[PDB]
Design a protein around this ligand. Sequence first.
Ligand SMILES: Nc1ncnc2c1ncn2[C@@H]1O[C@H](COP(=O)(O)OP(=O)(O)OP(=O)(O)O)[C@@H](O)[C@H]1O
Ligand SMILES: Nc1ncnc2c1ncn2[C@@H]1O[C@H](COP(=O)(O)OP(=O)(O)OP(=O)(O)O)[C@@H](O)[C@H]1O
Ligand SMILES: Nc1ncnc2c1ncn2[C@@H]1O[C@H](COP(=O)(O)OP(=O)(O)OP(=O)(O)O)[C@@H](O)[C@H]1O
Ligand SMILES: [Mg+2]
Ligand SMILES: [Mg+2]
Ligand SMILES: [Mg+2]
Lengths: 17, 464, 477, 345
Amino acid sequence: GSMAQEQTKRGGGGGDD
Amino acid sequence: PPSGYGVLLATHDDDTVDVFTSGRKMRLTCSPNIDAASLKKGQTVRLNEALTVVEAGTFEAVGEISTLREILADGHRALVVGHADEERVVWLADPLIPRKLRPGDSLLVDTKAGYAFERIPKAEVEDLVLEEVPDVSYADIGGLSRQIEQIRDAVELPFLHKELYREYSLRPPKGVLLYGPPGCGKTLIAKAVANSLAKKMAKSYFLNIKGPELLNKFVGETERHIRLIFQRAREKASEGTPVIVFFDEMDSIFRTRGTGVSSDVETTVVPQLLSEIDGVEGLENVIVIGASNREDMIDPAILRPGRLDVKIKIERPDAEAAQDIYSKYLTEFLPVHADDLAEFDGDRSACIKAMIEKVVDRMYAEIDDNRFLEVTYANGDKEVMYFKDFNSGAMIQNVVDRAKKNAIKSVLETGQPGLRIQHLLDSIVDEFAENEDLPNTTNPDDWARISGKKGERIVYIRTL
Amino acid sequence: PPSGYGVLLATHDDDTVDVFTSGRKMRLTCSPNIDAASLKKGQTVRLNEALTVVEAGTFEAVGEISTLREILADGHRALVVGHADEERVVWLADPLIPRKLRPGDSLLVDTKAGYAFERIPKAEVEDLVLEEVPDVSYADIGGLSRQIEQIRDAVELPFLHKELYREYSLRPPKGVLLYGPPGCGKTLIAKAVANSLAKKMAEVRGDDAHEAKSYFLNIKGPELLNKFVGETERHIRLIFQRAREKASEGTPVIVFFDEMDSIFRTRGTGVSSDVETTVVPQLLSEIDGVEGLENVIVIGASNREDMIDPAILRPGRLDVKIKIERPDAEAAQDIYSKYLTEFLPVHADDLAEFDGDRSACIKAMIEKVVDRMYAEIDDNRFLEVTYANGDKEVMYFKDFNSGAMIQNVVDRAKKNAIKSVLETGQPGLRIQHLLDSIVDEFAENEDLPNTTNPDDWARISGKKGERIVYIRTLVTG
Amino acid sequence: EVPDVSYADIGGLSRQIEQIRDAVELPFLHKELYREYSLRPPKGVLLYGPPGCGKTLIAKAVANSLAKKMAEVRGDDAHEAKSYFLNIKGPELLNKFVGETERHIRLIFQRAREKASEGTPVIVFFDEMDSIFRTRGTGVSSDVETTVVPQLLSEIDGVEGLENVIVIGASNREDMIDPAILRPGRLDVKIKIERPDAEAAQDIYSKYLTEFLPVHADDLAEFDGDRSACIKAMIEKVVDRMYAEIDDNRFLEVTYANGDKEVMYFKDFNSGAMIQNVVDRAKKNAIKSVLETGQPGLRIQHLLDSIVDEFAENEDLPNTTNPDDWARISGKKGERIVYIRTLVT
Ligand SMILES: Nc1ncnc2c1ncn2[C@@H]1O[C@H](COP(=O)(O)OP(=O)(O)OP(=O)(O)O)[C@@H](O)[C@H]1O
Ligand SMILES: Nc1ncnc2c1ncn2[C@@H]1O[C@H](COP(=O)(O)OP(=O)(O)OP(=O)(O)O)[C@@H](O)[C@H]1O
Ligand SMILES: Nc1ncnc2c1ncn2[C@@H]1O[C@H](COP(=O)(O)OP(=O)(O)OP(=O)(O)O)[C@@H](O)[C@H]1O
Ligand SMILES: [Mg+2]
Ligand SMILES: [Mg+2]
Ligand SMILES: [Mg+2]
């Protein structure tokens, strides 16, 4: 019976031009 | 003969235009055939080898799609977010400037040109907020004629002759609160009035949201869900068509903001709804209908006049209302016993009416054959509460279903295609053989209310 | 003639300037018509097939929004980061050397040209804080003359007489707290303040349209709360940065926290939520911190003053505390007069005894309505209250009367009159309709009382001296 | 902008200003004696007390003094002078991504250690660190502090430590502060800011009721134009009225768990901010009277009735004996207070 707060974890992403 | 294409940017007083083509912006002159006044921003223009605009068509239908973040105060630009959270301040085409664009809308854009062409509808946002078509009518509800009249007066009349209200400067009601014992038909009235309003217009939209569905594990999600629901309602009502928002089982969520539950998040959910109804921003054509069998548990701030001002108390059906419900759930087309048909000489309507009258007479009786509960009050007086004080509509439905099941058993055992009155008579007493949730623990709140009506506090409950 | 565009980088005394176009930089001479000194940094120019700078202008187009991190020592270049955490320095344009730049400000940049052109206002604030101007004005509010005068002196007075305040060395209050029982009217006062502020800037200043919308940032109570860490604090900081940058010399900015009774929490309380420990200190530091705001007014509306954190209620943050009380007889008469105007359809039979004097008839009807509503009779007996001392005290409907209830009664009477017109056919409004509406409204609220009801204990137990322990509905049936 | 306040603008705090000067200014004014005695400047300073009692005032006065010192020592550039004071503004370090607030803290402390030059202190002020200050187990909604606190306390003292950087923290909820950070070697000086007494109230009023404020001619008539004497007499009368045990000054009745009864006046819940608000309200009444009647002048009755107006405005704000300040008095009595009732009319 309690609430939570989220911390994100960024995922790798890369593009060319 | 070959001719290219470009994106128009703006117009000039020198009868010159800006065209984006091949990733570069150029200054061009319109051909004498076309008129420079008719040109619009973002419109595709046909070019030539001499770099002269000769014809302008429609807008491009392909490209990237981005989420709208905000509209700049200048009224000609919009900040949007790309797929990888890249933020772009792009021009708005003529069609963009129905309702005005809101944050979260999807726009068809091309980054190199930097224009937003068309608002692309999304199916996910439509599916998130359900809008079903109610089918229950006023005919399906019986024994609540005065309540139907009240809800017609509070909903139907303000939109029937709204010009008369404007002449009288009367504000249409903003909130209706249905309350009463459980199983008395709270949802049916809302569905019926929604269907009637939908048929009355000659267009409306109805939003139904349940109680527990507005609860999330995290914090800050129920409030934004409510905000999105009310934003959708405002978007639908901005055209002027009335919009009905129905909250189901308000007892569970946004209870009393005081003590209430010793451990609940309610203290941060009720005010938001309040701010959505009464605030600096006031909704115009939105009607909020709430239904709760526990009116005392609802937040008094919500029940303040002006928000949910209209208050309707449904009461348990009496003998006449029970007869009306039985007539609603027993039609002429229903098979009947051959003996009864012969007795009535083919008058099927008279047969079913007489059977209904017999059933309702059996249900309402002070004989000790229909004993339900024993109640001892504070004074110590023992009273036998029979079925007459607990005849809910859902109970009548269960009685009819059990009688029909008994009829199926009889026809599969014997073979004669008919329904006996004795089937319903036996189903009346077999209804309470299985619990219908009417009995409860030592001191229920419903029985406390009944005692307050009686004047002596109920202390003892005994099954009979 | 066909022609292209380019971005100006720098100007030289040799009548030659650097222009970036087609992905490359070239040093080209300007046409005789244009003046070299007239051109500025960061503004676009128009070239030709022979690459002659013929026309000037300014750059207003698309571009990746970059987050400004810091300003370098020379003051003409700025470091910005992009979406992919790419850090790069860019020459600042002329219009950016306006309010002083701050870290984290969004900027419009062109990576190929390397110039920052303008600061984009934060999207997290503008799309939500702004609201449409309500029609409510100070005229449409009655029975709160002292409260209206106090809020006027707190908000508008200091900026009308700036020299007088400067002579005494006095500053406008840094916070106003509106509080009272539900339905007594606080959002109405907020609407009046917003309308007055919009009227002041749209006409007396007359800058441009939609500017009055920009001021009076209205934010609902829980809407700042969100499921993340630091997101609510970021929203608060962005709101106060916008307020600080929009606050001018004598031009005020009002931040209205609707439903401040639950201002994200009461600190040190709340089993289900613990966001107070991070949201309350941020707000407490923004207001009256090491660096303080100049011309920003914070206004909050509350129904439970006790549930607000004490550190924010102390003077210096929420200075002027305005209390709204339940209307008495004179205030009830004023409130009724605010709705029963002389423009309603009045029944001829009701005007028969007044010889057509509609105003006198309306005044008499209001007096009769007030007398009926405030009568001390058994019909007006609503509840009985028992306390620790056990003295049974009777509470009438007058103890729960409010402006909202008065408006509801008037609307119900109008609906009854419309029903009578529809059925019988005689037009007009009758006093008996008002009496029937009063009776129905009083009878419809018999199910409101429960085991415990707040908003009245703090007013009853203070005089009685004992806490409310029992509530009973009186004679019915 | 560095605040324009100075140490001369703070009244009623004499020992506290001496302590804050000894923690910061003294070690750098007399480096030779400190080297002789092998003494290093205190690593941390803590300010706490009831709200509105002047913690942020000291925090900004020390920043102004540091800015003036750096201007008169290194150079007249404003940015370099201001760069030696750092402001946290509360929970600014918290970020959505995992492990980014720790990186920000590490960057802050490494830059701070690089800035110090053994003659120039670097001051990092944690404004209302009650958010960061958590006992690592009291979290209910989130426990980002479980990661933030170890990083900060390891940066402060560890195998690689800061030499000449002063960490100043200001707080109102000392109980919520983590015990580890409340340790000698991390917060050496514990300065407690207390609510003003009669002499402190007089000093604060003198700081706010300057002799340059216009005064009504009738008031100066008694003192024959002696502005200073009239103003000090008015201040004495105001402080006597406010700090008086009158039946009109009874504020709250306090009942503890043990059952002891205590009558508390409005003077118990007093602070410098309240005095400033009273003065501002009196000035507002004076300017309103000037506008209405056309005659300039601030009178004593304006102060006298502004006092009662303010006391009536803040006369009712209790909430289930929240131990903001009741903890100390309850410890004096022996048990936590549970019952209170407002003594109004
Ligand atoms: N006139 C009527 N009065 C009461 N109940 C009726 C009536 N007609 C049909 N019913 C039956 O009552 C049942 C309940 O209707 P409804 O959904 O409106 O109330 P409910 O929300 O189920 O009640 P509860 O709040 O106890 O869940 C329906 O299944 C319907 O078959
Ligand atoms: N002079 C007045 N005093 C009180 N109420 C008034 C007055 N004039 C109009 N009203 C009506 O009172 C109603 C309630 O006002 P308002 O919405 O400000 O209450 P509220 O402070 O929002 O209540 P809550 O804080 O419980 O939400 C309004 O709809 C308004 O029409
Ligand atoms: N000698 C003094 N003692 C206390 N307060 C004073 C004094 N002189 C002026 N003040 C006023 O008190 C107000 C509050 O002081 P300060 O901001 O330093 O503490 P605070 O930040 O309110 O404390 P908290 O953060 O606990 O609320 C200031 O606005 C200042 O004008
Ligand atoms: Mg239902
Ligand atoms: Mg309100
Ligand atoms: Mg402070």
